[PDB]
């Protein structure tokens, strides 16, 4: 059928809920910065992997690329930003996000918020993005609600 997916991105908090159950939550004050990634099985919605890449810091984007490249094309892929995910989100990682169909990922900027749900090998199911209005500010919280189709048989 479908999965009811909720993805929240903000300065101080991320969460992901699937069918009304929270599968990822991070509101720890000075922890969990960067891009949180959840991978779901495309038939059951079970969580196959959960990661966080602190892409405000060097080398985390490289780890993110190596991880995403191992994710199977049929998987549901969910990304959400806590605090800052762009400073060291460099060209190879942005090109990979573009190849998934993400519009905001390849454009991600300083303290922007971003929530994404898509099938790894395409298409994107939902995406939201808020641009930070000033270097001293963060993007607005975004809460993406998306009905994700499930595979069967
Ligand atoms: O002047 N600057 O280049 C500059 C000024 C203030 C900055 O604050 C930091 O920003 C990070 C990303 O949001 C936060 O993780 C961190 O806790 C702190 O708030 C960073 C850079």
From Swiss-Prot:
This is Protein O-linked-mannose beta-1,2-N-acetylglucosaminyltransferase 1. Belongs to the glycosyltransferase 13 family. Changing residue 24 to R: In RP76; no effect on protein abundance; reduced acetylglucosaminyltransferase activity. It comes from Homo sapiens (Human). Constitutively expressed. An additional weaker band is also detected in spinal cord, lymph node, and trachea. Expressed especially in astrocytes. Also expressed in immature and mature neurons. It is linked to Muscular dystrophy-dystroglycanopathy congenital with brain and eye anomalies A3: An autosomal recessive disorder characterized by congenital muscular dystrophy, ocular abnormalities, cobblestone lissencephaly, and cerebellar and pontine hypoplasia. Patients present severe congenital myopia, congenital glaucoma, pallor of the optic disks, retinal hypoplasia, intellectual disability, hydrocephalus, abnormal electroencephalograms, generalized muscle weakness and myoclonic jerks. Included diseases are the more severe Walker-Warburg syndrome and the slightly less severe muscle-eye-brain disease. Participates in O-mannosyl glycosylation by catalyzing the addition of N-acetylglucosamine to O-linked mannose on glycoproteins. Catalyzes the synthesis of the GlcNAc(beta1-2)Man(alpha1-)O-Ser/Thr moiety on alpha-dystroglycan and other O-mannosylated proteins, providing the necessary basis for the addition of further carbohydrate moieties. Is specific for alpha linked terminal mannose and does not have MGAT3, MGAT4, MGAT5, MGAT7 or MGAT8 activity. Changing residue 83 to A: Moderately increased enzyme activity. Decreased affinity for N-acetylglucosamine. It comes from the Eukaryota. It is found in: Golgi apparatus membrane. A carbohydrate binds at residues 33, 83, 111. Residues 1-153 form the GG-type lectin domain. Interacts with DAG1 (via O-linked mannose moiety). Interacts (via transmembrane domain) with FKTN; the interaction is direct and is required for normal location in Golgi membranes.
């Amino acid at each position: 059928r479908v999965l009811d997916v909720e993805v929240y991105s903000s300065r101080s908090k991320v969460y992901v809920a699937v069918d009304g159950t929270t599968v990822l939550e991070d509101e720890a004050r000075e922890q969990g910065r960067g891009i949180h990634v959840i991978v779901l099985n495309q038939a059951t919605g079970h969580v196959m992997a959960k990661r966080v890449f602190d892409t405000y810091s060097p080398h985390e984007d490289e780890a993110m690329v190596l991880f995403l490249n191992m994710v199977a094309p049929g998987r549901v892929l969910i990304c959400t930003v806590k605090d800052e995910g762009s400073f060291h989100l460099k060209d190879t990682a942005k090109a990979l996000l573009r190849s998934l169909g993400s519009q905001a990922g390849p454009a991600l900027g300083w303290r922007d918020t971003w929530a994404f749900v898509g099938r790894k090998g395409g298409p994107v199911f939902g995406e939201k993005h808020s641009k930070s209005p000033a270097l001293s500010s963060w993007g607005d919280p975004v809460l993406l609600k998306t009905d994700v189709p499930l595979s069967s048989a």
